[model samples]
Target: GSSGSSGMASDTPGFYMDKLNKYRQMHGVAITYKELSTSGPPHDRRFTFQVLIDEKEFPEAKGRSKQEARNAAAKLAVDILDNENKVDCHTSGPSSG
Candidate 1:
């Protein structure tokens, strides 16, 4: 299983990145991503995402835990985008969530 995991490692980060990019594109906003910090070295890494909107820092937060930080930032992003009506552009389907 260890080697199988390594075999899939090449695309793991790209998978998340690709989805994020597509979501941004669907909303018709140009985006850029920044890695503010990494919690540890390569083998044990944690990421901080700084997602920008219109060249401005859109949602920003610092978290002691990685998932909490990401969720906080993403919620802020959704709020900002929804406020600007970007969610309409991003989704033309029913939103029951």
Candidate 2:
């Protein structure tokens, strides 16, 4: 039996999408995904996707299906935040209006 806070970072094989979405909540703006061109036939295909985070254009990732592509890209985005130490640590006002 383990009980703890939900505020935990899960850098695993999956859950990147959820991770990115939660990351968005921490700030204000959220991340969006874009679709590039696909390759090969239906059975044998490759998907390409990119991330549009905040205002800057994030990196892109490729996968066999649209599923992994998104997760991979999200992972990239999270890694990006880590690259600059604690997600770049942007300073923005979240004051109520």
Candidate 3:
């Protein structure tokens, strides 16, 4: 069981990723991600990432940085899982994932 404290500061998507990880652990499932594509110019590039939860794919999301883009994808996965009431997960700590 968790102590209910992530012991660090984190952003919205990071928090969600923590929750999602816990949920996957509890249910003995695996999560994966893929780089869908990249667009934009040299000065500013946009990254698109896709998240796969339990082998099901979610729509890709974009972000300025690679981490940001992956987080966007994770956020969607967490949101969908939460809405389905299939898992109880929440994050604490930093947005490194």
TM-score against native, each model: 0.42, 0.64, 0.67
How would you encode candidate 2's per-residue C-alpha lDDT over 1-97 as one tens digit per residue?
Answer: 5555455764445687877778788876757889988866878888988888767677788888788888887778888775644344567779769
lDDT of 3: 0.77
lDDT of 2 at 5: 44
Candidate 2 positional error at 32, Å: 0.9
Q: Sorted on TM-score, highest at the top, how do the candidates line up?
A: 3, 2, 1
Q: What is residue 92's positional error in candidate 3, in angstroms?
A: 42
What TM-score would candidate 3 get against the native? 0.67
Would you list the rank order by lDDT, best first? 3, 2, 1
Candidate closest to the true structure, highest lDDT: 3
1 or 3: which has the higher TM-score?
A: 3
Residue pairs of candidate 2 with colliding backbone atoms: none
Q: How does each model score on lDDT?
A: 0.57, 0.76, 0.77
Our model 1 lands, by Cα RMSD against the true structure, at 11.2
Candidate 3, residue 88: Cα displacement in angstroms equals: 23
Q: Across residues 12-86, which tens digit of lDDT does each residue of candidate 3 receive?
A: 446655777898898878888788789889899999987777777777898888888888888888888867655
Off by over 4 Å in 3: 1-13, 85-97
lDDT of 1 by residue, 47-84 (tens): 66656766657656544456555544555665666556
